[PDB]
Design a protein around this motif. Structure first.
Motif, PDB file in Angstrom:
ATOM      1  N   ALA C  10      35.874  12.524 -17.621  1.00 29.70           N
ATOM      2  CA  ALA C  10      36.737  11.603 -17.275  1.00 29.70           C
ATOM      3  C   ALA C  10      37.825  12.112 -16.614  1.00 29.70           C
ATOM      4  CB  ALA C  10      37.031  10.784 -18.253  1.00 29.70           C
ATOM      5  N   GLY C  11      37.899  13.454 -16.501  1.00 33.48           N
ATOM      6  CA  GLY C  11      39.279  14.217 -15.964  1.00 33.48           C
ATOM      7  C   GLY C  11      39.190  14.144 -14.594  1.00 33.48           C
ATOM      8  N   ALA C  12      37.802  14.411 -13.732  1.00 31.71           N
ATOM      9  CA  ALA C  12      37.774  14.183 -12.694  1.00 31.71           C
ATOM     10  C   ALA C  12      37.198  12.863 -12.166  1.00 31.71           C
ATOM     11  CB  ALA C  12      36.740  15.298 -11.955  1.00 31.71           C
ATOM     12  N   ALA C  13      36.862  12.042 -12.923  1.00 31.50           N
ATOM     13  CA  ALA C  13      36.409  10.699 -12.657  1.00 31.50           C
ATOM     14  C   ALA C  13      37.412   9.758 -12.312  1.00 31.50           C
ATOM     15  CB  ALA C  13      35.445  10.203 -13.678  1.00 31.50           C
ATOM     16  N   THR C  14      38.856  10.217 -12.719  1.00 33.90           N
ATOM     17  CA  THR C  14      39.971   9.260 -12.251  1.00 33.90           C
ATOM     18  C   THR C  14      40.702   9.625 -11.142  1.00 33.90           C
ATOM     19  OG1 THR C  14      42.050   8.346 -13.180  1.00 33.90           O
ATOM     20  CG2 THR C  14      41.150  10.550 -13.887  1.00 33.90           C
ATOM     21  N   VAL C  15      40.119  10.514 -10.341  1.00 31.71           N
ATOM     22  CA  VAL C  15      40.585  11.237  -9.061  1.00 31.71           C
ATOM     23  C   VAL C  15      40.229  10.315  -8.172  1.00 31.71           C
ATOM     24  CG1 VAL C  15      40.835  13.160  -7.739  1.00 31.71           C
ATOM     25  CG2 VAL C  15      40.642  13.320  -9.862  1.00 31.71           C
ATOM     26  N   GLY C  16      39.043   9.321  -8.365  1.00 33.69           N
ATOM     27  CA  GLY C  16      38.758   8.494  -7.506  1.00 33.69           C
ATOM     28  C   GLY C  16      39.648   7.192  -7.239  1.00 33.69           C
ATOM     29  N   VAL C  17      40.652   7.049  -8.039  1.00 32.92           N
ATOM     30  CA  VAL C  17      41.733   6.103  -8.172  1.00 32.92           C
ATOM     31  C   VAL C  17      42.697   6.515  -7.118  1.00 32.92           C
ATOM     32  CG1 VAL C  17      43.389   6.684  -9.875  1.00 32.92           C
ATOM     33  CG2 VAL C  17      42.740   4.280  -9.349  1.00 32.92           C
ATOM     34  N   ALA C  18      42.963   7.856  -6.412  1.00 32.09           N
ATOM     35  CA  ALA C  18      43.623   8.291  -5.789  1.00 32.09           C
ATOM     36  C   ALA C  18      43.428   7.918  -4.369  1.00 32.09           C
ATOM     37  CB  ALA C  18      44.095  10.008  -5.850  1.00 32.09           C
ATOM     38  N   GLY C  19      42.136   7.678  -4.088  1.00 32.28           N
ATOM     39  CA  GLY C  19      41.651   7.029  -3.000  1.00 32.28           C
ATOM     40  C   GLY C  19      42.320   5.749  -2.606  1.00 32.28           C
ATOM     41  N   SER C  20      42.189   5.100  -3.707  1.00 36.52           N
ATOM     42  CA  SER C  20      43.038   3.838  -3.421  1.00 36.52           C
ATOM     43  C   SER C  20      44.576   3.767  -3.528  1.00 36.52           C
ATOM     44  CB  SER C  20      42.609   2.819  -4.676  1.00 36.52           C
ATOM     45  OG  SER C  20      43.806   1.669  -4.858  1.00 36.52           O
TER      46      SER C  20
ATOM     47  N   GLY E  11      31.110  12.537 -13.185  1.00 35.03           N
ATOM     48  CA  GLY E  11      32.455  12.349 -12.797  1.00 35.03           C
ATOM     49  C   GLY E  11      32.826  13.318 -11.503  1.00 35.03           C
ATOM     50  N   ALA E  12      32.113  14.376 -11.251  1.00 46.84           N
ATOM     51  CA  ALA E  12      32.357  15.220 -10.082  1.00 46.84           C
ATOM     52  C   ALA E  12      31.812  14.184  -8.818  1.00 46.84           C
ATOM     53  CB  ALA E  12      31.820  16.400 -10.170  1.00 46.84           C
ATOM     54  N   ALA E  13      31.003  13.368  -9.052  1.00 49.00           N
ATOM     55  CA  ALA E  13      30.335  12.803  -7.863  1.00 49.00           C
ATOM     56  C   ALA E  13      31.155  11.590  -7.621  1.00 49.00           C
ATOM     57  CB  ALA E  13      28.890  12.290  -8.104  1.00 49.00           C
ATOM     58  N   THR E  14      31.910  11.009  -8.486  1.00 49.98           N
ATOM     59  CA  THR E  14      32.300   9.636  -8.047  1.00 49.98           C
ATOM     60  C   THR E  14      33.981   9.793  -7.808  1.00 49.98           C
ATOM     61  OG1 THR E  14      33.351   7.676  -9.162  1.00 49.98           O
ATOM     62  CG2 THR E  14      33.201   9.610 -10.549  1.00 49.98           C
ATOM     63  N   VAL E  15      34.239  11.132  -7.171  1.00 55.00           N
ATOM     64  CA  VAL E  15      35.387  11.366  -6.491  1.00 55.00           C
ATOM     65  C   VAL E  15      35.020  11.188  -4.872  1.00 55.00           C
ATOM     66  CG1 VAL E  15      34.983  13.888  -6.366  1.00 55.00           C
ATOM     67  CG2 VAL E  15      37.253  13.012  -6.116  1.00 55.00           C
ATOM     68  N   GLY E  16      33.773  10.984  -4.589  1.00 52.37           N
ATOM     69  CA  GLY E  16      33.140  10.768  -3.313  1.00 52.37           C
ATOM     70  C   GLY E  16      33.393   9.286  -2.898  1.00 52.37           C
ATOM     71  N   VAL E  17      34.060   8.243  -3.937  1.00 50.43           N
ATOM     72  CA  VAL E  17      34.402   7.118  -3.487  1.00 50.43           C
ATOM     73  C   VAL E  17      35.700   6.732  -3.460  1.00 50.43           C
ATOM     74  CG1 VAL E  17      34.741   6.073  -5.762  1.00 50.43           C
ATOM     75  CG2 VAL E  17      33.550   4.750  -4.211  1.00 50.43           C
ATOM     76  N   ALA E  18      36.568   7.883  -3.500  1.00 55.27           N
ATOM     77  CA  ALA E  18      38.080   7.848  -3.120  1.00 55.27           C
ATOM     78  C   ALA E  18      37.976   7.871  -1.782  1.00 55.27           C
ATOM     79  CB  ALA E  18      38.525   9.222  -3.612  1.00 55.27           C
ATOM     80  N   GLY E  19      37.221   8.847  -0.898  1.00 56.48           N
ATOM     81  CA  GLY E  19      37.505   8.832   0.687  1.00 56.48           C
ATOM     82  C   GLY E  19      36.889   7.531   1.197  1.00 56.48           C
TER      83      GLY E  19
END
Lengths: 109, 132, 72, 48, 72
Positions: C10-20, E11-19
């Protein structure tokens, strides 16, 4: 000269400027750019005006008509101008001024 | 399409009321093509050419001194021009020496109004030398 | 060591909210540059930002709910 | 906005010059058409 | 140890949805300054809006199917 001759005994106070030497040589477009240029070196902010000229109908008949002039940017930017694009307030400053030299040229012919 | 290309001058009426395809407008903030449902804009013009495109074989060439567009709500653009001059009646020999003349007179302007005016004069004189 | 991967996942999985984050910085800035040219906001101009805010937000909180459901 | 703005000039002043700058560049066969315009006909007299 | 590499890469894959969250912001952002000039909205503005929306999704959703593929 002949308008100012009639209207100098009652309306002698509402005169910005006067011109002379019209129509002895044929009138042109550069003649309408001296009327419209000295009309800006006057200081008078004007927001509504009109021009009155004789619309040539036939050899016997002429008809004196009037046409309106919108000169402030406030009245020139209204609800019909909502669709109208890239022109700014500073471009509508430019466009309406060429219409003043234009609409004096239509009444010099 | 369905575009009445109006274009005239005080001396002689040019391409008038005819369905012509594409018009070039020389304008401060650049030149922009008129494409058949062009957005209405009342912009005035700078010195430059108008190369107007029709189905009659090849395009014509003109030159507008200082014009104005009023493209309306429907497909009807009206172009005006004080001097819609033809190009071929221009003489290149006297035309070049004007450009070096006014730049030589730039620093003889002791006021601030005429110093813009000589900048206007070289811009009008630079407008023709790229054209010719 | 099993909970050790529960925390860094969950440390890198919440980087996907930075895309929003940066994707919402445009669509609220584009209602600035495109409002002055045409004052008709109570028509569909403001309504196409709320659709542009919410459906850009829906990919924000979805990549938040991964970080909950990876951990529990 | 350009350099003629914030300097004291306008568009009609811009149009008188780039007309003459074109009209003086003509050949010496069509000189009379530069005299066809001839804006120096109207005079100005002031009230005061 | 097998769960260690599984829980990071999901979690490392779902930073791909940020883009995808970035590119979806412009499509409801440029249509704001696209419609602001030209009110011909019921025509192909919105039809080019919905196609632009559901195409940036398919570069975000396509990683998400691959993201659940890692777990199973």
């Amino acid at each position: 000269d002949k308008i100012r001759g009639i209207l100098h005994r009652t309306h002698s106070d509402q005169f910005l400027v006067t011109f002379k030497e019209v129509g002895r040589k044929p009138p042109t477009f550069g003649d309408a750019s001296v009327i419209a240029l000295e009309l800006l070196n006057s200081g008078y902010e004007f927001d509504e005006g009109s021009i009155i000229f004789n619309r040539f109908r036939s050899v016997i008949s002429y008809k004196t008509e009037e046409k309106p002039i919108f000169s402030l940017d406030t009245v020139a930017s209204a609800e019909s101008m909502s669709i109208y694009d890239d022109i700014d307030a500073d471009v509508l400053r430019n466009y309406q001024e060429y219409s003043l030299a234009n609409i004096i040229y239509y009444s010099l012919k | 399409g369905q575009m009445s290309f109006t274009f005239a001058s005080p001396t002689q009426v040019f391409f008038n009321g005819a369905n012509v395809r594409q018009v070039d407008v020389p304008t401060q903030t650049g030149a922009f093509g008129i494409l058949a449902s062009h957005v209405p804009t009342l912009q005035v013009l700078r010195p430059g050419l108008v190369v107007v495109h029709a189905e009659d074989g090849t395009t014509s060439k003109y030159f507008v001194s200082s014009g104005s567009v009023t493209v309306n709500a429907d497909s009807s653009v009206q172009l005006l021009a004080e001097e819609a001059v033809t190009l071929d009646m221009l003489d290149p020999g006297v035309a070049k020496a004007n450009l070096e003349k006014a730049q030589s007179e730039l620093l003889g302007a002791a006021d601030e109004a005429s110093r813009a005016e000589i900048q206007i004069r070289i811009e009008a004189n630079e407008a023709l030398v790229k054209a010719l | 060591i099993d909970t050790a991967a529960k925390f860094i996942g969950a440390g890198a999985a919440t980087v996907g909210v930075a895309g929003s984050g940066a994707g919402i910085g445009t669509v609220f800035g584009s209602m600035i540059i495109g409002y002055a040219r045409n004052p008709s906001l109570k028509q569909q101009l403001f309504s196409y930002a709320i659709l542009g805010f919410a459906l850009s937000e829906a990919m924000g909180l979805f990549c938040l709910m991964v970080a909950f459901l990876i951990l529990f | 906005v350009a350099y003629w703005r914030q300097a004291g000039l306008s568009y009609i002043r811009y149009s008188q010059i780039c007309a003459k700058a074109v009209r003086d560049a003509l050949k010496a066969e069509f000189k009379a058409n530069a005299e066809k315009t001839s804006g120096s006909n109207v005079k100005i007299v002031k009230v005061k």
